[PDB]
Amino acid sequence: EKRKAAAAILSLGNVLNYLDRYTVAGVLLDIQQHFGVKDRGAGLLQSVFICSFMVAAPIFGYLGDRFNRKVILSCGIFFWSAVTFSSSFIPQQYFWLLVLSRGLVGIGEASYSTIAPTIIGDLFTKNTRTLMLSVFYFAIPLGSGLGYITGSSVKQAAGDWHWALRVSPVLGMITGTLILILVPATSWLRDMKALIRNRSYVFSSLATSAVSFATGALGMWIPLYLHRAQVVQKAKDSLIFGAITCFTGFLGVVTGAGATRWCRLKTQRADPLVCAVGMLGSAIFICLIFVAAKSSIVGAYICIFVGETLLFSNWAITADILMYVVIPTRRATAVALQSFTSHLLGDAGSPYLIGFISDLIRQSTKDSPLWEFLSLGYALMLCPFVVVLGGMFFLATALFFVSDRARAEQQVNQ
């Protein structure tokens, strides 16, 4: 029965992971004002972390089993929590030192972000495995919303990032203690070239990458769009959106669980197709939101409410597909390399690409705030098309999914 406790504590640790990733997506303006610094510094403080984590994902991948794992998970939680505990004290004299501070969480949390699913896989059988994996990825948006929640709570309470930068790391040390005592102790180039030759897992990686692109660009750029709307329609409600994202990620993950439960009795091709239709519908919603901005406010973000929840209905299924396809001896490298592909092709570049094409279109003609609305909407139309391409990638996996899950069982034999 102790496995249930293990799943619970890993899930809570993962929630802590995503909370302290997304926190500085909702207190960014305060620190920007405090250091008296440009927006490119903000781009640094939310991009160098992505770069560090994306490059150090494999350096724990090839570390898939090369040492005892429980120490790796405890080590990562403690070291990165101390990093943020330290960041809660840095002075005004130096800002690029804060850049490196919030960058270091990347390497220092690759630990929890890559290792943990492998323990989830080793520690369960199919049914409880997928249930606990569902909650374990429900971790993500829960912490997402909770990030903007912490930002709103501090800005309501005290106008300073000091009281928002210490709420997490204490919980971090708590999960460190428990994660060390409430879980059991359970060639590179050649193996990599062998891994790459798989022909479906690559498609799944591309797909999840496009999804991450979507969600990162969304998270950065929707609230400014809402600012533009409410200016046209004549803040704190943005972090009420943060809560909305929390609960709607809860809704999306339970939708994914129910969908796979209902369609498992159907053909095996359904689950990649389940995610495919999840992408199709979400993309359609985020396609229409741009004109729905005239109406979604009276509906209180109604369009995106279902859009991002339907989009967030493929995390767990993606993890399950990877769980099956790769050999357990290279499962860690599989997940880390997929995450690397996710950040490289996708979410990392989204802010800059949208902003740069948007500046292009704005510079094309005369500028008005309503024209700013129209132009940024026209530019952000790039995301829905990218994710419908991601959806047809899920389709291509599904058509390939029969013989490719056959290859997966072959790898199980291998």
Contacts of 23 (CB under 8 A, 6+ apart): 147, 150, 151, 164, 165, 168
Q: Are residues 154 and 211 in the same domain?
A: no
Helix/strand/coil (H/E/C) assignment for every residue in 284-299: HHHHHHHHHHHHHCCC
**CATH number for 269:** 1.20.1250.20
Task: Yes or no: say if 97 and 195 are a contact pair by the CB < 8 Å rule.
Answer: no
Query: Could you give the residue ranges of the DSSP H alpha helices within 158-200?
Result: 167-181, 188-196
Q: Among 245, 225, 357, 355, which Cα is nearest to 291's? A: 225
Q: What is the dihedral of CA 91, 96, 102, 108, to 10 degrees?
A: -110
Residue 294: C-alpha distances to residues 290, 373, 374 (Å) = 8, 11, 12
Separation of alpha carbons 214 and 345, rounded Å: 11
Residue where one domain finishes, among candidates 165, 191, 217: 191
Structure tokens at 321: 């597909």
Residue 263: C-alpha distances to residues 69, 272, 313, 394 (Å) = 35, 11, 14, 16
Q: Are residues 178 and 292 in the same domain?
A: no
Task: Yes or no: say if 180 and 70 are a contact pair by the CB < 8 Å rule.
Answer: yes
Residue where one domain finishes, among candidates 191, 220, 248: 191
Separation of alpha carbons 5 and 12, rounded Å: 11
Residue where one domain finishes, among candidates 161, 191, 221: 191
Number of domains forming the structure of the chain: 2
Q: Are residues 35 and 144 in the same domain?
A: yes
End-to-end CA distance of the chain: 31
Site of tokens 């619970």: 8
For residue 326, give its domain range. 192-413
Q: Are residues 4 and 77 in the same domain?
A: yes
Structure tokens at 262: 């209902």
| The total number of residues written for the chain in this structure | 414
Q: Are residues 223 and 246 in the same domain?
A: yes
Separation of alpha carbons 324 and 130, rounded Å: 11
Q: Are residues 134 and 238 in the same domain?
A: no
Separation of alpha carbons 283 and 290, rounded Å: 12
